[PDB]
Amino acid sequence: GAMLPTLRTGLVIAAGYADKVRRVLFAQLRDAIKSGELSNKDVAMAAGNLNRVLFELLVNKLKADKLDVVRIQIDYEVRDSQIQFDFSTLRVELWRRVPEEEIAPIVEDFARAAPRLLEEEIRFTVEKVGETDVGDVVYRIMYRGSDVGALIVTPLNGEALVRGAVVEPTPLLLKRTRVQVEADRIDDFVRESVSRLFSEAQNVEKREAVRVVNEILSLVK
Amino acid sequence: MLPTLRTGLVIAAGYADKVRRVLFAQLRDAIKSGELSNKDVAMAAGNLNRVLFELLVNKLKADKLDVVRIQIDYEVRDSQIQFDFSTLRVELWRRVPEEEIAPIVEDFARAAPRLLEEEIRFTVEKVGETDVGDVVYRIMYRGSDVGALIVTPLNGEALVRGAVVEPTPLLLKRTRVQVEADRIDDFVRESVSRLFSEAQNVEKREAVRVVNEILSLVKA
Amino acid sequence: MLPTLRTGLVIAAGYADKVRRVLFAQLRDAIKSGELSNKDVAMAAGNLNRVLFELLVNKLKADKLDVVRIQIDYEVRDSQIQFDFSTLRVELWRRVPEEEIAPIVEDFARAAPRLLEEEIRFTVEKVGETDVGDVVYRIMYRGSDVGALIVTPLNGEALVRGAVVEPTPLLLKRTRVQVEADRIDDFVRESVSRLFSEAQNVEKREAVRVVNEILSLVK
Amino acid sequence: GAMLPTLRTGLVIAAGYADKVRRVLFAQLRDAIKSGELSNKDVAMAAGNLNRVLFELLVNKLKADKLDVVRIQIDYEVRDSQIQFDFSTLRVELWRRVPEEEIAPIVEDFARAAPRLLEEEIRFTVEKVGETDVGDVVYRIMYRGSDVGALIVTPLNGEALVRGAVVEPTPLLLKRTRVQVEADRIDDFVRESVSRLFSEAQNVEKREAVRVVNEILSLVK
């Protein structure tokens, strides 16, 4: 009734799936082999059997190219000195390669505009989402009309505290910042200043940005 | 020549964190030594990620569940990181929808047990003979070249060794059989599948190497 | 700046395959483009591996079950890889014998289950006011600094949030508690463990960023 | 019952064990989460609790430094939307850092000689093991007095085929090579030529060399 361990290859070029499967299976069963529950031979045969099935599935049925990408997982049971895969748990993902002829032109041309983009300031817009229990105001942040983050403003007297994050086009964290407000409406000040505020935000992991966006949005909902 | 930032294969939704993590790993010594600040590296990765966003999401229309692999050279000058955009390479692989894959995977879940029951059927074709008179055969699976074997005739007996890469990598270790020299060809054609039903499961790279070693003996 | 072959952490027994695999991966594009052959790369990795063997076994006296991390710069000249040995760096960690580790782990393993669910006790030390008048506290575990807490006094209420990195990373999200302003110090010293007993389990890196964000407001 | 899944960190610097533990557990339980069998919260708490316990073991009991390396594994059972660790399966390995001050000077000195050490053929020695049933001669190969490989010699007529493999000081495969030599001179020939032969051997992965050595040694008797 307990969950079974799972053989997972992660992403691998299709030409390499067989040795990925074998190496992962050996790594997972290293202790079973040292303990004498299983022999090397047992594990090699189990991996070889699974590769034999995958070959028919990936190469003959799905027609995967050797330069495509696959990810495979399957659960297995080791008991009574025998390994059995549970094929009802087999999952296969496939990604098909975009021909270089199609990509390279685009990349080449784009690389010419790149040195500009590296430095050029990101322009964002905002729309009000609501207020918190404590009277903070929450805004959604957008990049080219699409939602990418959130901002939270705490009104003071002719100033305010601002904090927020965006996930795109690069993940940024705007740490608590105190700013003088020169506009009757906080709304007006947020509209004209959001891009300037983020021009000094810090670069972080996407995961961190996502957490902060979600925390802020949760305070209004 | 320059260090290269390399992501390896990554799901597109995760490319930015991979870029950041790889760059920090590569420049950990330059930071520990004060040559660069944590901030310098974060900003470099951040700026690169911004550029990659426009490329991947706009120009290449990559979906977040696609796979990408990215590399670009960079230089560390005067405590600044500078990317060489003429070395920017991007690879893209587009996800096959579950609808196309799931039913097919489902079939093999069902057919796997009986598929494993069957001995793998191989066929052979003579390729040539070596300097010392060993006979070399190519091995095929469903008509396509997958391997090779080599047979050394002795007096009334013979040594056999070989490998196949597909449908699973198998190494046939040196095996001694009793057979008359003038029937070795008949022997190979009749018994290739039986010989390999007892071969060793190995890495593909090993089987690939053995097949090439064998074939090279009959190619001048 | 030159490319750098880097192994990351690897058991000494396996450093050779790591060096080889990393070198091929880094030169994948130069091979494709005929700048180098597979033979050239394989041979370069092989020669480097031989040199590292001598250093590891003769000079560093590394055991095959020790851990190493190696790096060295290289360039490609006239279709041949050339290593720059002035940039060779090797780090080594020596295995603590299993015989010494196992009794300690085994004994502790017996108590682990009890310890698993038990409440973590924290203490605090007031740091002081921020510019706008929130109050920051350091959080300590067993007399050691592990986190920070920031309290924003309201009208008969206070907002509290914070984080600790040890003994496990926890994030206390924005929480509104009923407390009088003159009672805040006492409330915090009295309730910090209770508050964190229902904090969010997070990554250590998240908690670190939050602790630094908070302490920077008063440093 | 069936063998349980195992949480394994691989090698990790001690200061990073908690996040490795958390990331691996999430990766392994991603499907249980997506299926509704477990929540993100369940997994986060399981990992956090384990990390809490590991903190006491690593930092206080084994007294690991943050810059040491550790590797941790423990089995766990998931069933009925509940994660339970089996602490009787907890295994921890520790490696203590060798101070830079101590290694750096050794490495720097060695690096002076490294280039001139590549102008040098690897010197192997051999010892005869025995003959195979068909009369091939098998030798063990040694480097620094230790067994690192094997060679097999098949006498022809005034000639011989030689092949073999070593795993140290770097993995090398000597492909079938035909050489001129009288049969009663093979021992002498092998002593005098093994190092010269391996100077042109193929560089391979360690496992490839191991397999050849074993297959050659298995033929003896």
Side-chain angles (χ1 to χ4, degrees), chain C residues 4-34:
Chain C
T4 298
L5 183 57
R6 272 165 306 249
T7 61
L9 303 173
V10 66
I11 300 280
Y15 83 82
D17 291 351
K18 193 68 195 188
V19 157
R20 190 183 202 268
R21 295 167 180 165
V22 168
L23 195 57
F24 270 101
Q26 286 183 358
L27 291 175
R28 179 177 59 94
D29 268 25
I31 290 164
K32 284 177 52 176
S33 71

Short mmCIF file of all heavy atoms in Angstrom, two decimals, chain C residues 4-34:
data_model
loop_
_atom_site.label_atom_id
_atom_site.label_comp_id
_atom_site.label_asym_id
_atom_site.label_seq_id
_atom_site.Cartn_x
_atom_site.Cartn_y
_atom_site.Cartn_z
N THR C 4 37.14 27.39 -18.02
CA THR C 4 37.59 26.64 -16.86
C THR C 4 36.90 25.29 -16.82
O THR C 4 35.68 25.21 -16.84
CB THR C 4 37.32 27.41 -15.55
OG1 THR C 4 38.06 28.63 -15.57
CG2 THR C 4 37.77 26.62 -14.33
N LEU C 5 37.68 24.22 -16.80
CA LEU C 5 37.15 22.89 -16.55
C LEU C 5 36.90 22.79 -15.04
O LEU C 5 37.79 23.07 -14.25
CB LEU C 5 38.17 21.85 -17.01
CG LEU C 5 37.85 20.36 -16.93
CD1 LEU C 5 36.60 20.06 -17.69
CD2 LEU C 5 39.00 19.56 -17.53
N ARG C 6 35.68 22.42 -14.64
CA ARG C 6 35.26 22.38 -13.23
C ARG C 6 34.56 21.05 -12.97
O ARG C 6 33.66 20.68 -13.71
CB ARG C 6 34.28 23.53 -12.91
CG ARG C 6 34.92 24.86 -12.48
CD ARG C 6 33.90 26.01 -12.53
NE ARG C 6 33.32 26.02 -13.88
CZ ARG C 6 33.54 26.96 -14.80
NH1 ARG C 6 34.28 28.04 -14.52
NH2 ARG C 6 32.98 26.82 -16.00
N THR C 7 34.95 20.33 -11.92
CA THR C 7 34.33 19.03 -11.67
C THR C 7 33.12 19.12 -10.74
O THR C 7 32.28 18.21 -10.73
CB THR C 7 35.30 18.03 -11.00
OG1 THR C 7 35.74 18.55 -9.74
CG2 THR C 7 36.50 17.72 -11.90
N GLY C 8 33.06 20.18 -9.94
CA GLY C 8 32.20 20.18 -8.76
C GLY C 8 32.68 19.09 -7.80
O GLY C 8 33.74 18.49 -8.00
N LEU C 9 31.89 18.81 -6.77
CA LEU C 9 32.25 17.78 -5.80
C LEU C 9 32.16 16.39 -6.43
O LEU C 9 31.17 16.06 -7.06
CB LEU C 9 31.31 17.83 -4.59
CG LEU C 9 31.20 19.13 -3.79
CD1 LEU C 9 30.08 18.99 -2.75
CD2 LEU C 9 32.54 19.48 -3.12
N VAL C 10 33.19 15.58 -6.24
CA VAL C 10 33.16 14.24 -6.79
C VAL C 10 33.98 13.31 -5.90
O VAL C 10 35.00 13.72 -5.35
CB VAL C 10 33.70 14.24 -8.24
CG1 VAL C 10 35.17 14.61 -8.27
CG2 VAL C 10 33.48 12.88 -8.90
N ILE C 11 33.52 12.07 -5.71
CA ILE C 11 34.33 11.07 -5.02
C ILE C 11 35.61 10.89 -5.83
O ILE C 11 35.57 10.84 -7.06
CB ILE C 11 33.59 9.74 -4.85
CG1 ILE C 11 32.31 9.94 -4.05
CG2 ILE C 11 34.45 8.74 -4.08
CD1 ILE C 11 32.57 10.03 -2.53
N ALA C 12 36.75 10.84 -5.14
CA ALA C 12 38.05 10.77 -5.79
C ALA C 12 38.11 9.64 -6.81
O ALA C 12 38.74 9.79 -7.86
CB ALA C 12 39.17 10.63 -4.76
N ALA C 13 37.46 8.51 -6.51
CA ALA C 13 37.45 7.36 -7.42
C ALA C 13 36.85 7.70 -8.79
O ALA C 13 37.17 7.08 -9.79
CB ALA C 13 36.69 6.19 -6.81
N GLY C 14 35.97 8.70 -8.81
CA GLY C 14 35.24 9.03 -10.03
C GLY C 14 35.64 10.33 -10.70
O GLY C 14 34.97 10.78 -11.63
N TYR C 15 36.75 10.93 -10.27
CA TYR C 15 37.11 12.23 -10.83
C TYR C 15 37.40 12.15 -12.32
O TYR C 15 37.12 13.10 -13.05
CB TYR C 15 38.28 12.89 -10.08
CG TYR C 15 39.65 12.41 -10.52
CD1 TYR C 15 40.27 12.93 -11.66
CD2 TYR C 15 40.33 11.43 -9.80
CE1 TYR C 15 41.52 12.47 -12.07
CE2 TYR C 15 41.57 10.97 -10.20
CZ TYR C 15 42.17 11.50 -11.32
OH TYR C 15 43.41 11.03 -11.71
N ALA C 16 37.97 11.03 -12.78
CA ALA C 16 38.37 10.91 -14.18
C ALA C 16 37.21 10.99 -15.15
O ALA C 16 37.30 11.68 -16.16
CB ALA C 16 39.20 9.64 -14.43
N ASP C 17 36.13 10.28 -14.87
CA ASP C 17 34.97 10.35 -15.76
C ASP C 17 34.31 11.73 -15.73
O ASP C 17 33.81 12.21 -16.74
CB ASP C 17 33.95 9.27 -15.43
CG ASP C 17 34.45 7.88 -15.78
OD1 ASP C 17 35.51 7.76 -16.43
OD2 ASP C 17 33.77 6.90 -15.42
N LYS C 18 34.32 12.37 -14.56
CA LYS C 18 33.80 13.73 -14.45
C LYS C 18 34.59 14.73 -15.31
O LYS C 18 34.00 15.55 -16.02
CB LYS C 18 33.81 14.18 -12.99
CG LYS C 18 33.00 15.44 -12.76
CD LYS C 18 31.51 15.18 -12.97
CE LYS C 18 30.73 16.49 -13.10
NZ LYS C 18 29.25 16.28 -13.11
N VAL C 19 35.91 14.67 -15.22
CA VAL C 19 36.79 15.56 -15.98
C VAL C 19 36.50 15.37 -17.47
O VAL C 19 36.32 16.34 -18.21
CB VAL C 19 38.28 15.26 -15.69
CG1 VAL C 19 39.19 15.74 -16.83
CG2 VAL C 19 38.68 15.90 -14.36
N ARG C 20 36.43 14.11 -17.89
CA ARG C 20 36.16 13.77 -19.29
C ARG C 20 34.80 14.30 -19.74
O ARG C 20 34.70 14.98 -20.75
CB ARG C 20 36.21 12.24 -19.46
CG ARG C 20 36.21 11.73 -20.89
CD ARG C 20 36.20 10.20 -20.91
NE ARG C 20 36.70 9.65 -22.17
CZ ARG C 20 35.94 9.35 -23.22
NH1 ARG C 20 34.63 9.54 -23.17
NH2 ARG C 20 36.49 8.85 -24.32
N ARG C 21 33.76 13.97 -18.98
CA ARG C 21 32.40 14.36 -19.35
C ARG C 21 32.23 15.88 -19.39
O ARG C 21 31.57 16.42 -20.29
CB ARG C 21 31.37 13.73 -18.42
CG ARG C 21 31.30 12.20 -18.52
CD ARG C 21 30.52 11.59 -17.36
NE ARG C 21 30.45 10.13 -17.46
CZ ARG C 21 30.09 9.33 -16.47
NH1 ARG C 21 29.76 9.85 -15.30
NH2 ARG C 21 30.06 8.01 -16.64
N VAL C 22 32.84 16.57 -18.45
CA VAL C 22 32.73 18.03 -18.45
C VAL C 22 33.46 18.62 -19.66
O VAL C 22 32.95 19.53 -20.31
CB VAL C 22 33.24 18.66 -17.13
CG1 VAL C 22 33.38 20.19 -17.27
CG2 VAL C 22 32.27 18.34 -15.98
N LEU C 23 34.64 18.07 -19.98
CA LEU C 23 35.41 18.60 -21.10
C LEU C 23 34.66 18.42 -22.43
O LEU C 23 34.59 19.36 -23.23
CB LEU C 23 36.81 17.97 -21.15
CG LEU C 23 37.83 18.68 -22.03
CD1 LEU C 23 37.99 20.15 -21.61
CD2 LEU C 23 39.16 17.96 -22.01
N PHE C 24 34.09 17.24 -22.66
CA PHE C 24 33.28 17.03 -23.87
C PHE C 24 32.10 18.00 -23.92
O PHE C 24 31.84 18.60 -24.95
CB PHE C 24 32.77 15.59 -23.97
CG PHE C 24 33.71 14.68 -24.70
CD1 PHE C 24 34.54 13.82 -24.01
CD2 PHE C 24 33.76 14.69 -26.09
CE1 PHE C 24 35.42 12.99 -24.68
CE2 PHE C 24 34.64 13.86 -26.77
CZ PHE C 24 35.46 13.01 -26.07
N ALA C 25 31.39 18.14 -22.80
CA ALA C 25 30.25 19.03 -22.77
C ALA C 25 30.65 20.46 -23.12
O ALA C 25 29.99 21.11 -23.92
CB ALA C 25 29.54 18.96 -21.42
N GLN C 26 31.77 20.94 -22.56
CA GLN C 26 32.19 22.31 -22.83
C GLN C 26 32.67 22.53 -24.25
O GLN C 26 32.63 23.64 -24.77
CB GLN C 26 33.29 22.74 -21.86
CG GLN C 26 32.79 23.04 -20.45
CD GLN C 26 33.90 23.52 -19.57
OE1 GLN C 26 35.05 23.60 -20.00
NE2 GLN C 26 33.58 23.83 -18.32
N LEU C 27 33.15 21.46 -24.89
CA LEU C 27 33.72 21.58 -26.22
C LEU C 27 32.82 20.94 -27.28
O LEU C 27 33.27 20.70 -28.40
CB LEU C 27 35.12 20.95 -26.27
CG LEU C 27 36.16 21.75 -25.48
CD1 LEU C 27 37.51 21.03 -25.45
CD2 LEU C 27 36.29 23.15 -26.06
N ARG C 28 31.57 20.67 -26.92
CA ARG C 28 30.61 20.04 -27.83
C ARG C 28 30.54 20.78 -29.16
O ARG C 28 30.58 20.17 -30.23
CB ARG C 28 29.21 19.97 -27.17
CG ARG C 28 28.10 19.35 -28.03
CD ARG C 28 26.76 19.24 -27.28
NE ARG C 28 26.28 20.54 -26.82
CZ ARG C 28 25.42 21.30 -27.49
NH1 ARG C 28 24.93 20.90 -28.66
NH2 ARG C 28 25.05 22.48 -27.00
N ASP C 29 30.46 22.11 -29.09
CA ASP C 29 30.35 22.93 -30.29
C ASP C 29 31.64 23.03 -31.11
O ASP C 29 31.59 23.10 -32.34
CB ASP C 29 29.81 24.32 -29.94
CG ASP C 29 28.29 24.40 -30.05
OD1 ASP C 29 27.62 23.35 -29.94
OD2 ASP C 29 27.78 25.53 -30.27
N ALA C 30 32.79 23.02 -30.46
CA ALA C 30 34.07 23.05 -31.18
C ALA C 30 34.33 21.74 -31.95
O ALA C 30 34.94 21.74 -33.01
CB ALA C 30 35.21 23.35 -30.24
N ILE C 31 33.85 20.63 -31.40
CA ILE C 31 33.97 19.35 -32.08
C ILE C 31 33.09 19.35 -33.32
O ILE C 31 33.56 19.11 -34.43
CB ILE C 31 33.58 18.17 -31.18
CG1 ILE C 31 34.64 17.96 -30.10
CG2 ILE C 31 33.45 16.90 -32.00
CD1 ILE C 31 34.15 17.09 -28.96
N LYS C 32 31.80 19.62 -33.12
CA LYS C 32 30.84 19.71 -34.21
C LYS C 32 31.41 20.51 -35.36
O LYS C 32 31.32 20.11 -36.52
CB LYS C 32 29.54 20.37 -33.73
CG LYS C 32 28.64 19.49 -32.89
CD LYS C 32 27.42 20.27 -32.41
CE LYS C 32 26.70 20.96 -33.57
NZ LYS C 32 25.45 21.65 -33.14
N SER C 33 32.01 21.65 -35.04
CA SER C 33 32.52 22.57 -36.04
C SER C 33 33.93 22.22 -36.51
O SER C 33 34.63 23.07 -37.06
CB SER C 33 32.51 24.00 -35.49
OG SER C 33 33.51 24.15 -34.50
N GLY C 34 34.35 20.98 -36.27
CA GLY C 34 35.62 20.49 -36.79
C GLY C 34 36.88 21.14 -36.26
O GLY C 34 37.99 20.81 -36.69
#
